[model samples]
Target chain A: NDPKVIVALDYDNLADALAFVDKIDPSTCRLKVGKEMFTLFGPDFVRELHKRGFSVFLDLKFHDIPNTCSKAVKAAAELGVWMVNVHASGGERMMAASREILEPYGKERPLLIGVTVLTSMESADLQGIGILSAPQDHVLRLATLTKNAGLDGVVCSAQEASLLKQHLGREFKLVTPGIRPAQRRIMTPAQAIASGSDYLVIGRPITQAAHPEVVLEEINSSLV
Target chain B: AMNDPKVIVALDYDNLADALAFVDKIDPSTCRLKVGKEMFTLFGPDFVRELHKRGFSVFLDLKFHDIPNTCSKAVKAAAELGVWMVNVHASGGERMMAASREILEPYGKERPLLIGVTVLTSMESADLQGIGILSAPQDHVLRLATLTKNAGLDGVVCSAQEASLLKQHLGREFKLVTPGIRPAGSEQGDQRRIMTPAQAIASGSDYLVIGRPITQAAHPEVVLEEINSSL
Candidate 1:
């Protein structure tokens, strides 16, 4: 296994999502059901994906007070999600509290990760908000904090994967978004993998293509 | 309103054997069970689902509270459990409850009726005042009930002393689930806003949740029948 590339199924309804997940073989690519789909469809819908024998990464980006947020993740871990995350900016108390709550679960715990920096924005976005550091510095800082807080990994950009891997080692699991196989935004598959990215979350490239299977095959070929 | 009063059996015991021993004797048509933090922490989700499978309508009363976004996520997860009712604290305010309601709506109509808790039975009038709530337990329950109603909650928990006022102010339709209910000459223990089963129902309690009174009784089912006669 080359640690398969996960396709983020950003669909509106369960019908479309089910049809899409059904069409794609789980052996080839697992799924990432983020906030957009799960908010409307819910955990039963996630269970439906699980029943198909596909591993699901529930990307809720959970963040709240110490007691509440921990309880939230505890339930998620209970529901048997393969991977889940909280926002990196939720701070130490929030993250540590999350871990503390999950301690009661003897063995049934999901691979907990944290979102370092969102892929959609850049250094200009941070600079506009009076954050003096570069985008790389911000990502590094978040990744370091995420590791310190005892989370298994972080969600960052392909752009920061090389630096994160260099500092934190390959075992620290760098899940990178903003990976464009189609000529949409930037950072092609070759560049992302070359940067030592563990997993590439390709959204519109596989989903919005004219020929999805062909696009998926092409992306798979490119990554390999 | 005769048998209109809901019988709430608090499954607040520490073990499954005790909870099941209690649940085995009850009729589902006559009453509902509450699986609170104690039992759930010990037995977990499989046990909760088993109770539901046996024709019991459980109040999966976790009393979830957080900022809006996280609470919304948590409540949605709770909604998936298909509980008869679920609760959060009214003190968390309207945004939290409203967010919970909004997230649950798209699931169609199988969602749990969202209940909110007022002042806990453990707190006294002096305790309520000390925390900046000016009214006595009697008056504070009414004020909190009004807040609960205005927030679009399905019902509220209060003492029997406030049940009449809540019914009068919030109206007959708004359900008042009063806990801290003792039967006959039983000791009041830690609960401060205590009332007998008969008196509370007569005062307009829609639901009566009895904890130690029934669970700790020598003959729990016989005690339940005694309470039913009171209702």
Candidate 2:
């Protein structure tokens, strides 16, 4: 009943990723290479992961002009990833350009997703940042827009996964984050996955554990 | 030229996997990865070493324009990481740059290329002037480039339009790195004064600084080839 997991090796170096990999097997859970790690290192980090047979999630969260966004997506798709994302707020034309450019790659194309709203950010945070709607509503709005734009999924907090699934239907992937732990839960991945979350982005709980692999093993074992 | 100049690909992503995946394909012979604020904040120093281990050059482009001592400490830290290049704002002036250069010189003997940035390309003439620098954009850039050179720095971040004039005034080998380069036909993002890749090289650009045009191209390799052909 363990849920699918992505240990956030948010470090700039391979030592942490290596530390985790040395203990935790890539086959058990996936790896996420976000902006920080990728920018500090480079493609060799992902290549090393892929070379070790782990499906990499390149989380660049690109937001730019259509041609540029599409090219970035295509480049990521070519890198042989399991998924990639663009900011939905970048507008439909931009997101669609990303979707359209990767059409030729077919299945080889990484699952192109759009981020609806950030998990770490809250409703007040959204309003403070000038988002017109509440965090949930904003996520729904962006998720709808992303779906209409032909993206495969959306990155949202697990707290909103069920509502999104009910609204967007089951097929649209829901990649959730801000997962601390179930016991510490205000909202846990267990609840989100039960509500139909596709991937859980659990960072500190597993990555920072005394024994990260064991923590991951326990977390995955408890996912159901 | 390659040794004297380096292309800093702004990885500016939100995660490590994203940056590294792109680097795997990048030929360091042509380009180097730029680890900026976002990358460092998220990943930390260990990430810098991983890239160095992979044989790709690193430009720890934090744009460190701090006080002289802090700036020197930062450069010394970058030196320890074995970066191929690092930069600070030219506006950091003689003392700051000199302090950094002195701390870094011994290690940088044949190591990292210490560089400097001038006025950001995002601003126009009025913007620079509005900030009370009465000089024209080119003049200000020229002045800053001169200050950076005098401060014992190697290069300056400039657009291609400035390359010709800077090369003429500062000498051809001063490392006039031109960014904001578009291909024969590409959108001009937030960048105000941009030129095509060919124009940049012809203008005596040491290294062409580009991002969206190639990194955001549908076929990045194809786009790179087109740009390289133009170069």
Candidate 3:
């Protein structure tokens, strides 16, 4: 819970990603390796992050059949990430299977979370996918299913945090990702924490800066 | 606008040499190849270039579902692969798709067709219900496809069972790329909604993404050729 910021190393290549990793302090935040760099670099990149003392959030958002979803997290566990996730839309059996397969990891297992409605998507967007609920309601519904199926928490936008944490309770961890560089119609990091989000994933603000550590330290200082 | 229901083989292999061995057997003109997450994670864009070297069209099926910036940038990278197509989950929503679409606007017609994946063929009612949707597979598939179309994606990767309705509803220009195809005695495995090559092509699928049916066969291209000839 203390590592409040998760830097999204959504880089185009490994060299640049690692160079950025070397600049940041792992103690202040964990590193998130999403699809692109992970696709290009594989487990070796994640291992490299671990070598540098950072906990990795393997954010591939697995959404497939129950069995495929199950095995994917087990692989993520073996890769030794601090967190991993699946789409809440992948359904109950899918999340349950993903949970059961990680039984061997026990307490040492990575936090398993479900991706709820992305912040990029609005009410009309959820309607497009036939989810008629407002974004708050949709996040709560998926977060509830994710919790019931035994996942640690969910990936939601900052706006829905109070609603999810209020009903799902504080223990049902919420990992929020809509954090931007200079961007907010979105909230600042401290506000997100106040709203009950456990982790704020900040991307280009840090990654694109000439001095990433200076930017990261500013965000770190901004939060409690 | 019909692509004539070609077979886009799912090269869902874990090993590099093993997958390349399969690629060596099939002619690119005969069918395209799909490079999924597992293989792509291990091999990267260089492997995609290997498929291109052999004159194949690749479907970089990473199924990207992230924030708009991440999704758009990943699609932009996939464009550099010069792949035939790429995809994100339709569940990722309209802004995600539109952002991916906008990045590829520079690629013009050579850009990989940005498709959305609807309900996988393996999903049943329980799978849908567990996620909180009480509808059947086709209903979710149609809803997601409607969103994908609205988001301006070229088409969707849906099961062949929903192909006819999607083809009619989205009309002919919107492509339907179906994945579960079996050649009769080929065995169903985990897939539920399946059509034989002829049935899939007849049912309005513009492309059929066959995997173990061709990838696992003893004479891989024999099956690939068999499916194409049947088409």
Candidate 4:
């Protein structure tokens, strides 16, 4: 039931977000509503994508106290999204509360995920925050915490997926962002999957392409 | 500007119309308005401008936590929108916070209040331990709050419970906008470190962020009055 590609809807307006989603087939790629688009368009935006048969990833990266985080998850679940996420830095109780809130929804609830280190962050960035470990080391630690708290998966960079998959096992889903068809530091969609990422989150590469659909097709073809 | 009222109301609604309707019932004199992720997603900058037109200072509560460049750019955009306040996650580190501060610095007197988020009030001591922090939330919040101050930013958003401790060390004039404020008998909702409005005020919180207590009330104005009277 896991979709391989989740196209990040990084647009600032509903028109653009809807327009981007309009061009892609729901089956070809799922959609991700991050802080930018979700803050602009609201839950109705998620409903708009749902109307088009796309399974939405409501990526709010919630980080709050347990009860607040849980209630936020309940609200997201009520929206009937395919996935939702909280910041793993929010701790075990926060993740556990989110997990508990979704349990009542049974099969109807979105897959509650946790965000590890952001893809934009690196070793120096981790060090700046007083985290002595390398990015992958810190992400692995957080990912394990997420699993222990009963979250279904995590959002991490593809670079860490191979090690995480080996350490946490294949059942622990790895949703990789920062997938680029051509980039110096990032991995291609095929490479990300081969490295054991369960889902690839592609943003500007698809959204800003002259022909988004063609870009998605080419990326998908490259996967095998 | 530093003397701006401490009680900011989080206008956390799913839609613009509902938020606007609620805004009409309250007095901007007593509190500021916060447009967090959800409302901003649905309404955009126009809504912010509308609030300004109604004489309300908006707090663009996006909680941006990206790379230095992206975080700075996002803060710059928020400044351009003419918000009274904005925030980023302190977990993003000194460089990111410094960059964001630098972006807002160019505006000088016009710069919005830039804040950092410490441990979320919903989290407890154990939650901090799970994420690699050996200290309690109070210690971590103090640590992050100091980092924010050293970065040359404005203030922080912490639970009201930490306000007294933060105020004692961080000193006055360092803004503390708190969110976990429930009116005495109101539902606690998802906030675990919550306090009543009166308790938050007594604790020396620079601002109290009351959302459900007022927004969800039968008569929001009456509830607001009750809170104001209690304080």
Candidate 5:
């Protein structure tokens, strides 16, 4: 089952992350375990999320040589996460090798996704890295690569959700981060869903809100 | 240092106890040991020290890839742990790789072998195309290896399939630490590009990282001997 929103547990402290989790229903949203929290708390923390009935998106964005990358994914799969990811830039073999580790599990395998382009990056950032294409164009190319590699979906910005959905089809999940209450240039929860985003990844908007439960309620209701 | 055998047994265990117990049988003098993310995450820097106490030069294989500041700090942390080797993703861009190399500037002679990971051995030409790289696997590895070299790092981690090519182009002093080694008739596992222990040595690989073939064997000691004798 897919959760509409994934609240990223991006906090450095375990107590802070867990306390935020206490305010929301596990059925309403999923949990994302990024590099910061996973590196700090390790597998024990992920198990705690499972204890609460929340599926975890182990957001390692693993990018390495094929054998080692697959071994890492195998370890993640053993933990029974809801999803895991590698950088699309890691190439098809690394992704396919990662996918192969989970193939034996059949339906039991976690949804293996790829990072098309990080939400934090922009056109200038891409240019700095010698990538001449615009962010959207680059994301589309990487998303195409990810699909060809047989990944389940991608981690992209809500801005590109519509374009990706039209091209990659509805079967591929689009987990979009950068959802906020208000911004100079960002989509709200409703806007993201309307744009065809499968999962909206909201971190600070919910976690840092004065009343987290109420914030979640408002966001959920507004999606209607 | 030049005479040191190139075999590196991957310590890919889940816990420190199992890893330590396995090392009891391994002759650290014959080969180095690799402590990747799993073992390091479970036991932390202390486990690395324990390996050092057992007379093994540890290859700390975290494969750090992030922004320049973060990647540099992580490499510095690995250096502080006193590992024999460390690595970063070459795709992390020039600044990130440069920053990783820059932080170790003060270490001088104490610097660990800073290797850049190129295209993984499990990857092939098709996989490269999927990622939008038109080059063949070997060509892609060479391109990345060149980027790593120009970034002022020590060497690269690649498949043994590219060893002779790299050795000829990058010079013998440029170390090539390869993974994906299988003994004759051993399971290939997730590794796509593979060579036998002796084949890898014959191709001029500076190090061969054999994981499950030795570690998960019925008798690791015997398998280790088989690999060494074959080489």
Candidate 6:
């Protein structure tokens, strides 16, 4: 099984990103390449991550037309990342197009996940967007669409993990971000793990740490 | 009176070579270019800079949506690239849009036209409800636009169907960049609220984002000029 931690690499340059990677190994955790670094470094940056033996989650949170998003997922697969995701709000057919595009890749295909409401958004933010449900309910509705479309999982905050697990059942994967330390942790690594998240994406906390590897290693130890 | 390019070409290509060849056939003076997630992922900022070298003003359509700080960081990177226009999802709410605005402020007059995207042209009330949203596209989009203006964005990327309403309410100075624009006789594909070039302009859209109709054309500039002249 893959490790329960994903280090969200938000670097704006390749050297800075790779320098961070040099501190840890694939055994520690998987890596996440969000929009900033990916747009600046492109697929070659991803290839280098793979070359270093780390599995990468390409988290662009794609929200476009079906054809456009499907092609982007195919491109990410071509780069050989460990997982990729699209916005669940992109709707059913859009998410379905992405799942269908990955069919030809067979068993080795990357885990296709759907993003269900950003971690930064709150219930009020959801209401502002005209979504009537609470954040968890919105995630459940979209997670259902993601599951129906044949994606492997959905990206949600660890706060939504319990709700998702109870309803979606165990096999459905959950990757959560916005992980902080302590009460700010919302749920500690242990809490999120117990809550049924398959992986936790941690940025700033580790990336800006005095010793990134120390934070990452300690996070991995805490997960167990 | 600022004269902005009317047609923002969505260069939704899967490859760099094909997109490069397409930009070669046209000039920046005729139309602006849009490099969205797909092309940006496949190629990166190098492609955006490449488009710039060819003299086209680029709309780095990343549609940034995150926390206030995160959105600010993303827009800071965008401002450094110095794109012609950039946008965030209006649904990202007021604080996020305001954060991006403040991020661009240091760049002064050289910053891209920071805007917000309302309902996409392909979506409708049924689509919105499926995602747990209750309002129709028209009503939901207006609310989003209201927040965008309050957040101090230049305009929004809305369907031409909502263009006239927003233009009237938000005022003519509030730019409206409309996508899902297909010239007459072109395929509608996935977009539901599409309008022809003439219709979109007449509807008060400040910029018409036409993709496949121009990108798939054998001679791209001819279609651009036809739309340009018709406008």
lDDT of each: 0.69, 0.70, 0.81, 0.79, 0.79, 0.83
Cα error, candidate 2, residue B29 (Å): 20
| Best-fitting candidate, scored by lDDT | 6
**Which has the greatest TM-score?**
6
Clashing pairs in 5: none
- Root-mean-square deviation of every model: 9.5, 11.6, 3.6, 4.5, 5.2, 2.9
Candidates 5 and 6: which is better by lDDT? 6
Candidate topping DockQ: 6
Range of the 10 consecutive residues with the lowest summed lDDT in candidate 5 chain A = A123-132
What is candidate 1's lDDT per residue for A1-224, written digit by digit as tens? Answer: 54457788767566877777666767677688865455445567778888898887877676544554576677677668877788665556667778777777656577778876555335553432223466677777778877888877888776677888899888888787768775545788778888877777878777776666676677778876
- Give lDDT tens digits, candidate 2, residues A1-224: 22378777776456866777777777688888875566446566777889887887887666544655676777676677888887675567778888998899887789998976544445543433234356666677778989999989898776677888889998999888767665555566567678788888878788777887777767677774
lDDT of 6 by residue, B1-231 (tens): 566679999988877888898999987889999988778777878889888888889999978776787777788888888799998888777888998999888899989899998876667777777777787678888999988998899999877778888988888889988876776645563354556677788998888888888888888888888778878
Model 5: per-residue lDDT, tens digit, B1-231?
Answer: 355757788887876678888899878767899988667545556778888988889898877776676567678767777889998887676677898899998888878889998766556767666665565666667777887887888888867767788878887878888876787646663254556777788887878888877888777878777777877
Residue pairs of candidate 1 with colliding backbone atoms: none
Which sections of candidate 3 miss by over 4 Å? A13-15, A39-44, A105-107, A178-191, A208-224, B1-5, B134-137, B185-194
lDDT of model 3 at position B100: 93
lDDT string, candidate 3, A125-194, tens digits: 7777767777776667778889999999998777788888888887988888767645448788888888
Ten consecutive residues with minimal summed lDDT in candidate 5 chain B?
B185-194
The number of clashing residue pairs in model 1 is 0
A-chain TM-score of every model = 0.87, 0.91, 0.92, 0.93, 0.93, 0.93
Measured with C-alpha atoms, the lDDT of residue B117 in candidate 2 is: 78
Question: What is each candidate's DockQ, to 2 decimals?
Answer: 0.04, 0.02, 0.47, 0.28, 0.21, 0.55
The TM-score that candidate 3 achieves is: 0.86
Evaluation by TM-score, superior candidate among 1 and 3? 3
Tens-digit lDDT string for candidate 1 (B1-231): 323326778786645686787778767756778876445434555667878888788887666544465556666766766787877766555666778778888777778888887666645654443233445656555555666688788888877777787788888888777776777646653354555677788898878887777667777667767677767
Q: What TM-score describes the B chain of model 6?
A: 0.92
